[PDB]
Amino acid sequence: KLMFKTEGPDSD
Amino acid sequence: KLMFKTEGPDSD
Amino acid sequence: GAMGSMERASLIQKAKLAEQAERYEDMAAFMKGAVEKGEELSCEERNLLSVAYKNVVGGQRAAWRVLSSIEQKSNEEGSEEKGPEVREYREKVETELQGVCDTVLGLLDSHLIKEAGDAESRVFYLKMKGDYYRYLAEVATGDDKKRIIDSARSAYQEAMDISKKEMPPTNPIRLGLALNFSVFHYEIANSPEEAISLAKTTFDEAMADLHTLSEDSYKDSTLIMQLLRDNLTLWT
Amino acid sequence: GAMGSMERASLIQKAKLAEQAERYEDMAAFMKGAVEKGEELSCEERNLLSVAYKNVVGGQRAAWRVLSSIEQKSNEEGSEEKGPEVREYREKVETELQGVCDTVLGLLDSHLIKEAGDAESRVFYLKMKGDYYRYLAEVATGDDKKRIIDSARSAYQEAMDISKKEMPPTNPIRLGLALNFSVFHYEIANSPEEAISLAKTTFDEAMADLHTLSEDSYKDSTLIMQLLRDNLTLWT
Ligand SMILES: N=C(N)c1cc(-c2ccccc2)c(Nc2cccc(N)c2)s1
């Protein structure tokens, strides 16, 4: 999946 | 610590 | 409470150690323990709570997506019947993810949100509430999907309302909330236009307030502004 | 056995899924379950077992070293007394690491090693036995440290003896064993000369056997040879 930017650790 | 090369996944 | 016998200050100290060791499950358990002491959290303590669970749920979300993708392929036309294992294991991971989300929502409801009166705490926790409902929504397929989505929206909206009244447009919490609510709109609520409008307006209003800030505050705000811009680039 | 009710084949399938999802703790638990079915493991199954636990123990080793380093700093001359937390938490992680090592040694002793008659299985398992004793040795400080070290050496030595009699010098298992035993010598046994001699001789004897191999076998052997070379570069 293209994941969009969300706040904080990009831990996924 | 300088870790030397050991077999398989360098998971540390 | 497995952490019931440890001092609050020791739990916080150990959460910080756990973070340095990249032991996020431990970090989350220590911060859960600290919350359950019943005192309000400081700014730093709120950030430790959020970072810990964000890292835990992040691993589970990434794993879920891998498994979901495999499962979907296994149900294509021409795929060989591999049996129930893919579904079973995606379900196992999904259930653990849902448990983590429920745990966090439980802390927010008992009793972090109701004791939070300052804008910076209350907005932080309501944003978290929206975020963990959003993570539930990502995996929801049942007759509760609509209510989960509406729970995310409701939490995000209350946070937005307070943030607009009580915080300047460059406030990093306010910016981070808008970022996340915009992603909610884009891919959970199937509202890409709303997503784009929110991200644009948020970016533009922060830009016009940057002149008021110190160098350090400027760095903090522009970091999140760049995330808004990154999404807008993908979306337009 | 939490995995006692699941089919062997399903455990193996789920181990493979867990690997794709980077869920190594799950991968290890599934392979533990497969081993406890009591049948011997195939080559692929042995590799899944090893990869899973290697990834689990790797996280714990990296965490232990972070915590150990902090603890050592806290005991320097001029460091402020932070209380027992650093030690307590390093102990917590250490104990979990030791549990994982004991779990693996338990599987090898009950009953993987005693049923392994072929060189490729028996050498694989004895190498693992040496490796997990080595991981115990890395954190050992008590009156058992010498016996742990001797247990690692003994397992490595039996593996080396079989590997030299039964496998060509380019065999990737043989090479990987020599690599690991050389590191054992260098930093567990405080025998850097032995480490260097073993790595050199192993490299040179593999080099002279490469002519016998297919392109694919050549790739497999030269990968591990490069690890020997990497260490020799650091050591000389
Ligand atoms: N990973 C961690 N331990 C933290 C991350 C952040 C952070 C900072 C800026 C923006 C987003 C997150 C913290 N914030 C922090 C620290 C001291 C005091 C105060 N008020 C806030 S702690």
Ligand SMILES: N=C(N)c1cc(-c2ccccc2)c(Nc2cccc(N)c2)s1
């Ligand atoms: N991560 C994994 N699932 C595996 C890694 C390796 C591997 C291969 C070469 C060198 C070291 C490890 C496997 N080996 C494998 C596979 C099929 C058949 C046979 N015989 C052996 S499985």
Ligand SMILES: [Cl-]
């Ligand atoms: Cl499962």
Ligand SMILES: [Cl-]
């Ligand atoms: Cl602890």
Ligand SMILES: [Mg+2]
């Ligand atoms: Mg489900």
Ligand SMILES: [Mg+2]
């Ligand atoms: Mg339009």
Ligand SMILES: [Mg+2]
């Ligand atoms: Mg100990």
Ligand SMILES: [Mg+2]
């Ligand atoms: Mg010399």
